[PDB]
């Protein structure tokens, strides 16, 4: 899927480049520059305003999603989320930090469910995805002659196509209206439809109409931006029609920005009618104003919020797994783009002639080549920054500033140097955000980033051909070292960048295979047990069963237990140790998973570590509820119906002759345990009955008039914060209150030693819930972490099987 | 002492500046530049060669010290040490990284004693310090007329002065030869002299003569360097005489480089005879070639060795407390100097006229001012880098590269930008060397660094006056913003730098006083005990006595116990916890000590942490020996006279009716303990007898036929690595073998539980040594850490009193 989808997009981009080259054959860069300069100031200020209007309409797009999913949020929060998600989706879609991710990051602070957000994003996407053809047909129906002229098709054909589209639209609307279940409504604005297999959620009539108006206003404003930039204006209907088609074509192409394809379509539509140069200039200004500008605004906004949050709340925020690393990766990538493009384009003559005196002539050529290499390194270090490396942050901070220096020593291009330096400032300001002390060579291969790198290099070479089209091909251009000669510098640069990218890509591809997963040995198990003791978490006990492999921190202070199942690696709980060790461990696991081409999954995680999973790109699903009784409040001289039932149970148990005794680890009656375990059997998160496992923990045994009837090992630490029990077996013939006596006896015993809390157990998603509730415990949600895209049930079913 | 010595040096520098200003009044920068250009290539290549010759002779200087102190080292090591110590001493003497420090760092890897190195340095210093006047007199005796003309004094006066000096020299030599103790000789080349109070160590005749030849060749080569640079050459005798005097005057002035004063004296000597401009040019080239160049070579050498050591030995080196932070602090300081000086000097007209087109005219003035501020910040962040901060490393890495950018946007001064960038490269390459995550605002005030900052600012202003001496004073110069106007830019720069330095200096001086030292409370004590348990070191037990204050790491994982005594804070042992926590703690202590204006001292430290103390500027003295028995090798069925004596003791003890029993912490007979403690009493590193202290540890009591006779608390951890005993009391009336039975019983008991090692105790600097040796233990040295300068006995005596 991943390589196929990459290759498909890459080829589509490549084709669109070739199309644009063969379409702008007549135009030379001089003409284009003149066309760009031609545009009047009121037109620019108009487009700059229509951008704002069109982005304010995109807030309503988020409002419709909020209403559909039934999410109550503050208006300031909804606005911020809407703007930032749309801005960053539209520009760098699906490559870095998609709109969904930005929604899910921003809205998880308010404590909205992952399913709700997911639904919001899906609605926001499919809204445009399904309302695009309808608006295209509606626009086509106005002035068929103009539309036919634009598309270069017969009037009859486009007419019947429009009629066929609107007929299919109303037909589907009627069909879903037929299967409308009454009564139940998940939200005020939501219908449920029943087909037979699954119940699907569709918008209501009012919401559907309101979003369709919103979509209409959105695409209108978007098209108007591009309309104002054109000196000569074709009929609005046809223009809008083609814009819609082009937008569609760009989105389907799965090209990050829609660049290459969108421009190809517009140019093909109005190659002759509007000319090439004025259109190309309008397209560039459109892309700079409507895509690039908002993205940079969003980048700065979210950086600002992150910095403000860090400054205000200093103590609570410890590890910093916020919203800086992804933005900085984006800005760094853009920087590398800016370096590579500059390297392709020839310098200004005036700047070169001034510089020629100050700097030696060969240094310029050297500077230029190195600056091109640095550009490619900046492309590939985006991934590093994304994964919160510290090495990557150090290297990138150096390169961005060296690159900014060479940008002044290549042709005194201060516009480049300014941006590179500004980026390097922001990168240095967020120093804490990059903590991981891992090796850069250990970063996994990422097809996507390499794909994007190749695309950018392609676009640089395209720009090289288009810029240096006034020089004849010659073999002597390669060696030609002189000031005025721009084309040699570009050629050298392009070759150097192409070789360096190829080298690094091949080096990453051909690397030593990772070691296979093995079970832990005696030493590892002992270390794991040591870690568990010197910690708060007693749930770590299931590490010692020697059934699931162990990932150890470099400091051997904290560890994480995981097991491979099919194509997905599952981690049993949160990592065991201090917070700073936990974050590094969660990343370490993600790295490992990626190396082995497996989905990372975290089973039964607490709420406190959720943002660390959100970082590495997981989503929290409500798995179950975990009960824990607080022994400080709980006392044997308290009131409450359940409490009176418990004391009655305890008193009867004592009178009947039930005795509970605790055996230290090692000194256990293995014969009696084996007997009861066999009796219970006759009649991953489980805990085996191997003696080795049992000798680690102290076992509480209850006896009924002397004979051993039931037992339950106890997970403990050296601290007296929390205590839990994993394995717990009872004899089928035992009295019904015997298990409850054992259970309450445990609670009282831990009260005696003075443990703050006592972990009862988890209920997923009836009897177990009631039984746990009968002790009057404290409930706490337990989550499941799965990749964000689409893996809701497959992973849960697979884990349930395991 | 510190403020007085600072003010004295600062005033001497100030005066020497004023002297040089009033002496080079006639010369304008044009004439000076012409004088510098005048010097021929053979003269430069001659001076560059005579520098090398003179530095090769400085190796023999180290050789004489090695022989005197009696230190056997490899020739490569001695060479490296000699070169680097002399190079860095001569340039940045006593301000940053003195020659002594560099010797003591480089030679402590081979495992040479601190007393030996100290002696080596003292000899190397005093050699020149005492051989300078003798050579001055010897030179004076040759051609009195020329010497008299040079000094502008009567021939008779200089003659009798020379005669008086040589008479005093031979008189002192005879006087020390009189009190020559025969027989004993610490080294082959060393005499001991007895005056009555203390025995002093003087060189032998052969060594004295050889070093005096070495000193003669050294100063000759040094003077020759400056001789070749002069076009017209005065008589060698007189010239050498004045050079000697000037060198002396510079050294006594305690000016880091000898700059200001040395030049003043030379200029005053040959103001009229040789002219000002040619002499000034010779002096500049001398300073650049003989001082600055070697320093930069040494800086690079030692950086290279550090990098090579890091690359080769990756695993053993963990925390990196090597030789990078001091060098980088030096290079950063030099960078800031280079920025400030450039800012004072006016730009080249050609470069300004080229730049005037590219850059807006006001930007140049802005760039120039900011670059001057950045220069002053680079001055003050040297201290930060020195103290291995990470904040300081991040900030400095940014500033050096921004400063390098502004250096190209001020007057396109690429020579500056190259150096700043090269420094910023090296600083980024040694990223690990700066680990401390402390706040920059928390750095203590340092009079020395501020003193050096003020000096540099002074020298910048001096350069400003001397460079812009072709412009008349006017009030309108401040506001004058134009390209060609250089003097306004310099004036603004100088003012901006002066205000920023004043502001920061005052801000550091006026700061909230540090909190006073308090005793630990119940919570702190409990935390300390927790830390001790989850650790290897059982010696941490004496923390719990609640007698000495506790410094806790930010992570509350490791801590360090210290107590103030008079004017020196003593830390009781190494910090307790992991290595990474230990380094930060040792620094944290140094910070604290500096805040309270107290000498840091570390009492009883192990060898493994020595380099962490060496970093913060301490020296290890051999305090005593600590015995520890290894229970793995030791067994009850072994052979050896001492072992047979032990088993005989054990068997007799058992037969007599001595019984040893171990009581858990809390469950102890306090009555019996109090009784025995009182009986023993009747008849900081001590351990009190307060019940609170005793309830923490398990007490071993021995009984003689039922009655309690002796006891000894046991320091333990949860691990079974090491065990120790602090407090140990016996009844006066007890049998002589009873204490030995208790002692051997402990050893056997710990064998039973299976503890690897068992700490016996320390003997400082007779009976105790024999008693410990009778168990056949393993000896390990125990050190004392005291400030490097001169605090050998005062601290030890003060600690002994406490
Ligand atoms: C050729 C145009 C018409 C064809 C339309 C379709 C083509 C589709 C396929 C090709 C994709 C577009 C290729 C062209 C890109 C822009 C080319 C360009 O103009 O590049 C300039 C330089 O390249 C760029 O500026 C490209 C930037 C593109 C990306 C924009 C990102 C901006 C933000 C970066 C991060 C900022 C960080 C700080 C703030 C957070 C060089 O021209 P100049 O005259 O402006 O400069 C001359 C000299 O070299 C220097 O002055
Ligand atoms: C005035 C000389 C005669 C008087 C002698 C006695 C005076 C004593 C009191 C004053 C002390 C000396 C003051 C003069 C310093 C040098 C002045 C100078 O020439 O400064 C130049 C610039 O300042 C310096 O270069 C000063 C450097 C001094 C320190 C040297 C350190 C070098 C190493 C730094 C670290 C390197 C890092 C990388 C390698 C590890 C500016 O002149 P320029 O024509 O060379 O340049 C013009 C334009 O501004 C730029 O080209």
TrEMBL record, chains A, B:
Q: Any idea where the Phosphatidylglycerol lysyltransferase C-terminal domain is?
A: 533-785
What is the superkingdom listed in this entry's lineage? Bacteria
Look up the EC number in the record and give it.
Answer: 2.3.2.3
List, alphabetically, the InterPro entries matched.
Acyl_CoA_acyltransferase, L-PG_synthase/AglD, LPG_synthase_C, PG_lysyltransferase
Q: Name one GO cellular component term.
A: plasma membrane
Q: What class of enzyme is it?
A: transferase
Q: Which Pfam families match?
A: LPG_synthase_C, LPG_synthase_TM
Q: Which GO terms describe its molecular function?
A: phosphatidylglycerol alanyltransferase activity; phosphatidylglycerol lysyltransferase activity
Instruction: Enumerate the Gene Ontology biological process terms.
Output: lipid metabolic process; phospholipid homeostasis; response to antibiotic
Record-linked PANTHER family: PHOSPHATIDYLGLYCEROL LYSYLTRANSFERASE
Q: What is this protein called?
A: Phosphatidylglycerol lysyltransferase
Q: Which organism is it from?
A: Pseudomonas aeruginosa (strain ATCC 15692 / DSM 22644 / CIP 104116 / JCM 14847 / LMG 12228 / 1C / PRS 101 / PAO1)
